[PDB]
Design a binder for this molecule. Structure first.
Ligand SMILES: [Mg+2]
Ligand SMILES: [Mg+2]
Ligand SMILES: [Mg+2]
Ligand SMILES: [Mg+2]
Ligand SMILES: [Mg+2]
Ligand SMILES: [Mg+2]
Ligand SMILES: [Mg+2]
Ligand SMILES: [Mg+2]
Ligand SMILES: [Mg+2]
Ligand SMILES: [Mg+2]
Ligand SMILES: [Mg+2]
Ligand SMILES: [Mg+2]
Ligand SMILES: [Mg+2]
Ligand SMILES: [Mg+2]
Ligand SMILES: [Mg+2]
Ligand SMILES: [Mg+2]
Ligand SMILES: [Mg+2]
Ligand SMILES: [Mg+2]
Ligand SMILES: [Mg+2]
Ligand SMILES: [Mg+2]
Ligand SMILES: [Mg+2]
Ligand SMILES: [Mg+2]
Ligand SMILES: [Mg+2]
Ligand SMILES: [Mg+2]
Ligand SMILES: [Mg+2]
Ligand SMILES: [Mg+2]
Ligand SMILES: [Mg+2]
Ligand SMILES: [Mg+2]
Ligand SMILES: [Mg+2]
Ligand SMILES: [Mg+2]
Ligand SMILES: [Mg+2]
Ligand SMILES: [Mg+2]
Ligand SMILES: [Mg+2]
Ligand SMILES: [Mg+2]
Ligand SMILES: [Mg+2]
Ligand SMILES: [Mg+2]
Ligand SMILES: [Mg+2]
Ligand SMILES: [Mg+2]
Ligand SMILES: [Mg+2]
Ligand SMILES: [Mg+2]
Ligand SMILES: [Mg+2]
Ligand SMILES: [Mg+2]
Ligand SMILES: [Mg+2]
Ligand SMILES: [Mg+2]
Ligand SMILES: [Mg+2]
Ligand SMILES: [Mg+2]
Ligand SMILES: [Mg+2]
Ligand SMILES: [Mg+2]
Ligand SMILES: [Mg+2]
Ligand SMILES: [Mg+2]
Ligand SMILES: [Mg+2]
Ligand SMILES: [Mg+2]
Ligand SMILES: [Mg+2]
Ligand SMILES: [Mg+2]
Ligand SMILES: [Mg+2]
Ligand SMILES: [Mg+2]
Ligand SMILES: [Mg+2]
Ligand SMILES: [Mg+2]
Ligand SMILES: [Mg+2]
Ligand SMILES: [Mg+2]
Ligand SMILES: [Mg+2]
Ligand SMILES: [Mg+2]
Ligand SMILES: [Mg+2]
Ligand SMILES: [Mg+2]
Ligand SMILES: [Mg+2]
Ligand SMILES: [Mg+2]
Ligand SMILES: [Mg+2]
Ligand SMILES: [Mg+2]
Ligand SMILES: [Mg+2]
Ligand SMILES: [Mg+2]
Ligand SMILES: [Mg+2]
Ligand SMILES: [Mg+2]
Ligand SMILES: [Mg+2]
Ligand SMILES: [Mg+2]
Ligand SMILES: [Mg+2]
Ligand SMILES: [Mg+2]
Ligand SMILES: [Mg+2]
Ligand SMILES: [Mg+2]
Ligand SMILES: [Mg+2]
Ligand SMILES: [Mg+2]
Ligand SMILES: [Mg+2]
Ligand SMILES: [Mg+2]
Ligand SMILES: [Mg+2]
Ligand SMILES: [Mg+2]
Ligand SMILES: [Mg+2]
Ligand SMILES: [Mg+2]
Ligand SMILES: [Mg+2]
Ligand SMILES: [Mg+2]
Ligand SMILES: [Mg+2]
Ligand SMILES: [Mg+2]
Ligand SMILES: [Mg+2]
Ligand SMILES: [Mg+2]
Ligand SMILES: [Mg+2]
Ligand SMILES: [Mg+2]
Ligand SMILES: [Mg+2]
Ligand SMILES: [Mg+2]
Ligand SMILES: [Mg+2]
Ligand SMILES: [Mg+2]
Ligand SMILES: [Mg+2]
Ligand SMILES: [Mg+2]
Lengths: 59, 71
RNA sequence: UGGAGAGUUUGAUCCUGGCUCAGGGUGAACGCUGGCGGCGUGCCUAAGACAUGCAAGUCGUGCGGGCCGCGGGGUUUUACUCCGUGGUCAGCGGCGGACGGGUGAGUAACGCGUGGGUGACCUACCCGGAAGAGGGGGACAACCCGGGGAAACUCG
RNA sequence: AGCUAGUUGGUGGGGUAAUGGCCCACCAAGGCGACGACGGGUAGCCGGUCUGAGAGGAUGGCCGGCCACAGGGGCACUGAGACACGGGCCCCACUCCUACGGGAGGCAGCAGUUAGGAAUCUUCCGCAAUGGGCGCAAGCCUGACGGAGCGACGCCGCUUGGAGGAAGAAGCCCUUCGGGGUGUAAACUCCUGAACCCGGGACGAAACCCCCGACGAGGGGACUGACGGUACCGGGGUAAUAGCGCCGGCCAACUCCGUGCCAGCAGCCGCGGUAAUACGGAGGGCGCGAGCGUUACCCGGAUUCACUGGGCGUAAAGGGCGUGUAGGCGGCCUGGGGCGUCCCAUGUGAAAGACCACGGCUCAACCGUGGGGGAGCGUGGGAUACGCUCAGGCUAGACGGUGGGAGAGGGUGGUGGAAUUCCCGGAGUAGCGGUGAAAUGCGCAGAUACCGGGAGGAACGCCGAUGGCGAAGGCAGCCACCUGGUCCACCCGUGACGCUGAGGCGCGAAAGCGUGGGGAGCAAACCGGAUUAGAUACCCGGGUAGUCCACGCCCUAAACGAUGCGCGCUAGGUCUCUGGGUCUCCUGGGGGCCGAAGCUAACGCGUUAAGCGCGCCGCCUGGGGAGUACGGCCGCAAGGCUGAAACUCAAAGGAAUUGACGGGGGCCCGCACAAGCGGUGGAGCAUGUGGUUUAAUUCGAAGCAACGCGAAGAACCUUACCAGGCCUUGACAUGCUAGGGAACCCGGGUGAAAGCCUGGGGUGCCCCGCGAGGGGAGCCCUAGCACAGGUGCUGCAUGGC
RNA sequence: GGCGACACACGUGCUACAAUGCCCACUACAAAGCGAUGCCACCCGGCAACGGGGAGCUAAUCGCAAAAAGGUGGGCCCAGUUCGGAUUGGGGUCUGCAACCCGACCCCAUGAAGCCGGAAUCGCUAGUAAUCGCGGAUCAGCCAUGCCGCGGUGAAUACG
RNA sequence: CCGAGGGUAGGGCCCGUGACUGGGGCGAAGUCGUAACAAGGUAGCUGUACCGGAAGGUGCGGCUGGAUACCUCCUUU
RNA sequence: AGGCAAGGAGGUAAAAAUGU
C-alpha cells in the first residue's frame, strides 16, 4: 500500500497494480489508490493522480 | 500526512532475534518482536536480555514494536 | 537515406556479466484532468449462460384453395353463381435459404501460405452456340369429414 | 524415442463429381522415425500489424483471403453446392413449459440482459446509397451495408484569445533585508470574435421505371435521402476549460519550511537515523497538454541466443580420453552434365496496407487515382568461376613399404636385494617407545639395541631429470615373452583413401562395492592417551574395513595445460630428450624457458600461440537456488549421467592496482626484550577515577594517547551542583517609548545575607529672564519594547587549540 | 551545603619496613629562582608554630636561606625497636568575615599497619637511574607528597 | 454391420485439494563454534569412503588455483 | 689450508573466544 494511512481493513475489495517494491521481500504488487475500498491518500497536493486524490477545490 | 499515534510504552528485553530484533515483554503485557531504533543503531547502543527499554508501538499492527531509547 | 547510450559489483580500475532506465507501440485498463470537430475504432475474460425485438426471404407472369374487397348480373331475396379484377392467408411448386453475418473453441494438419497438377473432377444461376419443346396418364397438399394428444402437434 | 496393424503396399469390389485404405474382402509385411516420427504443450493460418538501421523479433485486434465451428458429440437427408449458425434425426449436458406420458429451445447475427472480468458500446434510424436474394416489372425483404448514439479508446485538426502595457501593483515565495522571484503574467485600453442565435442549405441520385427509337443502341421524361435542417455558406454576436507528470543521477527542471532510517519515495542506484537540490507541503522551474501519468504486454536498447554479430587458460563455458556410425566438411590438373549459383525474359507475388507522385475532404488524420518495388516460387533460354556430380589424370595431404631406433607404453611368466614385521636360535638388560612437552603403550614370563636363520606380504632406494612413454586415467627393481603406439632416414609403392565426429562401443586415478584368496607395513572408522573452554581434530599408542592379487561392477575427479581435435601460416634466442646427416654445423620429431608481430580484461599467451585462418565437435548465456528436485536411463548398492523451474539477490565473478593486514620471508630499528639498578603490586597515608551513596557528592577526560587529568591552589568566592531566601530589561553591552525625578552621599527597619520597604540632606551643567520660572546636555530611577543571560545541548555542524 | 561522602575496587604518588640505618650535636659545599603592602635581617618574649619591635632592599647591592645527603663527635645494638610514622585525645599559632563539614602549622601525648611484598608490571643507557635537598608558579591560607624547574651525590649493565 | 455414447474392469495423464513430509533464499547485533581468506594458525581445493552438534575431520588418491630460510656437522672444488 | 657454492643431514618453526 502506497501513501500515508489507509481505510484498508480486512475484507476490503481492492485493486492491485503490479510493480514489485524493492524493500519488502516477496511483495510484487501494489494497491492502486482511489478505487473500490482503498481511497485517495488524503490531502496530497502534489503527485496526485498516482494516489487517487481528487483535485482540491481552490477558493 | 504523518500521523502522531504511537505508544511510547516500556518493556523488558526477553530475547535477542537476528538483525537487532527483540521479543520484548512490555509494561502492560504482550511480547512483540520489537526491532531496534535507527537512532540507537547509529549510536551503537547495544542491548542484551534483562534490560528495561522504551518501545514505540504502532496502531496498525500492535505486534511489531520499535525500541526507541537507549535502555 | 540508416545503427546514440546511461545507471549500477570496487577504496579506485579494466573487463565479464546481469538487472534497470530513456524510444516506439497497443483492441488496453487504472488514476487525475477534461472544451469541440473529423476519422477510425471499442467482450483481448467464460466457445459461460441467455429474457424481449428483429437478423432470409421472395414469386399470383408456376398452380389450386380459404377470407373479405368492388364492376356486373344470372340471382326478389337469400344463397350461390359466373368472371376480371383488389388485397391477404397458408398450401403446393420454384429459386434463395451453402451467400452475406458471427466467433477462434478446435486443429502443428496439405489447416494455412506459396507454386503448380487434375488423362482424377464438378460448377444452379450468367454468357456464346446448336437442336428442340409430339402425345398420354397420375398422385399429393391445401380443402372437406373423422378422430388421437394437455400442448407441441398428429394420424385416417 | 521409438511409433504404427486399415498400419503400409497389392488384387478385387463398394462408395464418391473424382483420385485414393475413403471403406471393405483377400493376400503380401510393410510404412514412418534423431534430415525428430509418436507423445505432450501450445496456437486458427495468412495478406498484414507493431518494432528494428537491417537482419530479425514479436504479433495475427480491426480491413481482405482461407480454414474450422456454430451448446458438446455423432449422423445423414435435401441440393448445383452442406453433413448446413437463425433446416432435419439421435445421444448428452443445461434452461424452458407439461394434464408428468411429453415436448421447447441455442445470440460465437445486430442490439440488449446477466455472469466472469481491470476492461469493451445503443434493446437507435434507414433501405437513400452500394451489395445480396427473389421477381417480367412494380416491388418485397435485407441488424449485409449506409448512417446516427455512447466511450479522450486511438489518430489528426481546432478552441480556451490577440496587440500593447512597470525598470516591475498586490497576493504568495525566497532574502545575505538592499533586493530577487512569480512577470507583460495580471489589472487596464484597443482589436478578433469558439460558443450561441437568426437566414439559407447541400453533394452524396440517377438509374431501375415510362414514352419515342425494334423491348437494340440512343434521346427525353418522372419519382426517390437514413444521415439531416447536418455539413457548410451569409449575417448577427460574448473573452470564452487547464491540466497532469516531473524537478538527486540516469533525465529537461531548485530553493524554503514540515519531518528525523519515522512517516514516506523508489524504475534501478538508493534517499530518510534534525541544514533532505531524493519524504510531505510551499513557491519557483521543466516536460507535455485535452491530456498527462501509472499498470500490463510486445519489440527496442540486449552484439544479453550474437546469420549479419559474441564467446570457452583465469570471468558461465573444452566432453576425462580413445575408436568410430550418421552427418558436416574437403588437395592439384583436364573434360562433360549444369543440380546448387548467377543472369535474362515472362507467369505469379489479389485487394487494402506499406513506398512514391498527384488528387479530394477549408488542413490533416482519412480517402481516391496512377506508378513502382517486392522475399519467394513457377516456366523458357543462357553462363560456367565456385560448390555438386560423373569421367580421366597427378603427388603436396593421408596410408603403405625398406632400414633403423627411443621409451616407467600395455599384458603375462618369472625372479633380486634393501627394509619393515613376525617366528625361532643366540648373546645381553632396564628400559624402550614416543613428543613441542608429555602420557597411555610394550618391557626381567627378558622388550629395546645386536648377530644367525626362516616365514611373509608389499613396495621398488640410488639412477631420476626440469627427463621418457602413453589418448587420457596413468606408467619406474631386473629379466624373458607376447603386443600397442611412435619417430627418423629412403622417397620406393598406393593415389585424396582425408579431417571431424551427434549417437555407439571401448578405455577411465583414488575411493567404493561383490565373490574368492592374501594380509607385512600402513591405515579410514573405532578404542586409548594427551592438547584444549570443548576436541568427535590435528600430536602420539594401537586398531578394523580398505589398501595387494584374481574375477566381476562402479564411473567420478582440480580425469587440469583448468587450453576439444586436425591442417596451413606468421621473428628469434635458449636448455632439453630422441632420430638422420657431407656432424665444432644443419635437418626431423617431442619436452621446457625467455621473447618479434599479433593477441589478451589483464594476467599472460607467444612455431607446442591463448596470434592469423579454415573444418568439425562439445559447451555457455547472471549468482544463488543446484548438479538439486522431477522424470528417464545405468548400477547389486553407494551413486552416476541427464537436468529444471518456482523463488531470490543486484549482483555473483575475473584480472590486476592502491592500501590494511598475516600466528608469510628478508633487512632494519626503539629501554622493545634481554644485561643491570631501582621501584609498582603488598603497608599506611596523599591524591585522581570507577562504583555506590547523596539534596547535591557539578561537568568533562576512557586502552596505549582517561585515571597527582582540565584545576598553576574547592573553607566563602571559586562553583558550574543542591537547599532555601530573593531579583527581574535583569550583574553586563547597545537603543526606544514615555514618565516624573534626577550629579552625589548617610542612614533606618527587616533579614542569615542578599533583597525589600523607607527617611533625609542632594543638584551643579548649557543657560534665557529683574524674577517667578522654563527647557535640554551629563547622570541615574520606573513601566512595556529592541534585547541581554544560559558553564544548557550538539566536538557525529564547526574554527581555534 | 556539596565538589572533601565511603562496603569496596582501580590508577599515579609519598613514607616506610631500619644499621650503607636512626636520633642528636657541631661543621661545609650549590644552583637556579623569588620578594615591596612583599621578602622580612637583626633583638627580645616565648618549648614552638609565632609574636612584637625593627633596619635593608624596590634587589648581582638587603633579604628568602638553613641547602640536605655530606664530614666529624656522641648515643642507639637488631627489636616492631630511639626503625616506622599512621591514627587519635588534648593544648596552641597563623591567614582570612570565618577553619564544623573542610586548612596549614606547632607542641605534648598515642605509637597502628608495615621486617623488602604473589601473579604480574613499570622506569631508566651517564651525570642517566638511584638517592638528597632547594626554588618557582596557583596562592590570604593551603590540603602540593602534585607540577614545572634547579643544583648535590652518583652507579649498575647493554653478550646479544 | 459400423456406430456417438454408456457400462464393467485395468492403465496412463492433467487439474483441485491434500494429512504428513522434505524444504531453500534472505536478514544490519541470534546462537554454537572458526571450517575458509595471511605456511588463516594442521596448506587449500578436490573425487570418493567412514564418522561427527555443526561447520568439518580423517583415510586413499588427485591437483596447485600451494609452498622451501638460519646456524651445526658431513659429502667436494 | 681458506674461499665460494653444490648436495645430504641435524636443530628452529609447534602455544591466541570475552567490550563502548
Ligand atoms: Mg513522488
Ligand atoms: Mg565481487
Ligand atoms: Mg553498490
Ligand atoms: Mg561503492
Ligand atoms: Mg464516432
Ligand atoms: Mg470472444
Ligand atoms: Mg403466398
Ligand atoms: Mg463467414
Ligand atoms: Mg459484432
Ligand atoms: Mg500435437
Ligand atoms: Mg499446398
Ligand atoms: Mg509438408
Ligand atoms: Mg493453391
Ligand atoms: Mg437448387
Ligand atoms: Mg393431369
Ligand atoms: Mg479402385
Ligand atoms: Mg486410414
Ligand atoms: Mg481388412
Ligand atoms: Mg490443449
Ligand atoms: Mg486456442
Ligand atoms: Mg504465428
Ligand atoms: Mg478477417
Ligand atoms: Mg454459448
Ligand atoms: Mg445441436
Ligand atoms: Mg454440432
Ligand atoms: Mg443454414
Ligand atoms: Mg446442424
Ligand atoms: Mg461446416
Ligand atoms: Mg441464432
Ligand atoms: Mg451480440
Ligand atoms: Mg451487467
Ligand atoms: Mg463483475
Ligand atoms: Mg459501434
Ligand atoms: Mg424500418
Ligand atoms: Mg439494390
Ligand atoms: Mg406482389
Ligand atoms: Mg422482417
Ligand atoms: Mg455500421
Ligand atoms: Mg472526439
Ligand atoms: Mg481515462
Ligand atoms: Mg497578453
Ligand atoms: Mg468587435
Ligand atoms: Mg439553422
Ligand atoms: Mg483570462
Ligand atoms: Mg538535471
Ligand atoms: Mg526522484
Ligand atoms: Mg520535495
Ligand atoms: Mg496513455
Ligand atoms: Mg537482439
Ligand atoms: Mg557469431
Ligand atoms: Mg560474451
Ligand atoms: Mg570457469
Ligand atoms: Mg580436456
Ligand atoms: Mg577420429
Ligand atoms: Mg563419413
Ligand atoms: Mg573440391
Ligand atoms: Mg562430400
Ligand atoms: Mg497490393
Ligand atoms: Mg493504392
Ligand atoms: Mg489536398
Ligand atoms: Mg578422381
Ligand atoms: Mg610411413
Ligand atoms: Mg619398420
Ligand atoms: Mg629373541
Ligand atoms: Mg613415390
Ligand atoms: Mg600412379
Ligand atoms: Mg561419444
Ligand atoms: Mg581401488
Ligand atoms: Mg600403526
Ligand atoms: Mg580421542
Ligand atoms: Mg581424550
Ligand atoms: Mg592414529
Ligand atoms: Mg575388495
Ligand atoms: Mg575407476
Ligand atoms: Mg596440472
Ligand atoms: Mg592430471
Ligand atoms: Mg574440465
Ligand atoms: Mg574426442
Ligand atoms: Mg608425450
Ligand atoms: Mg622443439
Ligand atoms: Mg608486443
Ligand atoms: Mg612466454
Ligand atoms: Mg622455439
Ligand atoms: Mg582468449
Ligand atoms: Mg556428483
Ligand atoms: Mg531419480
Ligand atoms: Mg581477485
Ligand atoms: Mg629487561
Ligand atoms: Mg595517561
Ligand atoms: Mg575539532
Ligand atoms: Mg565527549
Ligand atoms: Mg575533585
Ligand atoms: Mg589494591
Ligand atoms: Mg606487625
Ligand atoms: Mg628487623
Ligand atoms: Mg636512547
Ligand atoms: Mg587451514
Ligand atoms: Mg576430504
Ligand atoms: Mg592428501
Ligand atoms: Mg573459480
Amino acid at each position: 500500500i502506497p501513501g500515508e494511512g489507509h481505510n484498508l481493513q480486512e475484507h476490503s475489495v481492492v485493486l492491485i497494480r503490479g510493480g514489485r517494491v524493492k524493500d519488502l521481500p516477496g511483495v510484487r504488487y501494489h494497491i492502486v489508490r482511489g478505487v473500490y475500498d482503498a481511497a485517495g491518500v488524503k490531502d496530497r497536493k502534489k503527485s496526485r493522480s498516482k494516489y487517487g486524490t481528487k483535485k482540491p477545490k481552490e477558493a | 500526512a504523518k500521523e502522531k499515534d504511537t505508544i511510547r510504552t516500556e518493556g523488558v528485553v526477553t530475547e535477542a532475534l537476528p538483525n537487532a530484533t527483540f521479543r520484548v515483554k512490555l509494561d502492560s503485557g504482550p511480547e512483540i518482536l520489537a526491532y531496534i531504533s535507527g537512532k540507537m543503531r547509529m549510536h551503537y547502543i547495544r542491548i542484551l536480555p534483562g534490560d528495561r527499554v522504551v518501545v514505540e508501538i504502532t496502531p496498525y499492527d500492535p505486534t511489531r514494536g520499535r525500541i526507541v531509547y537507549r535502555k
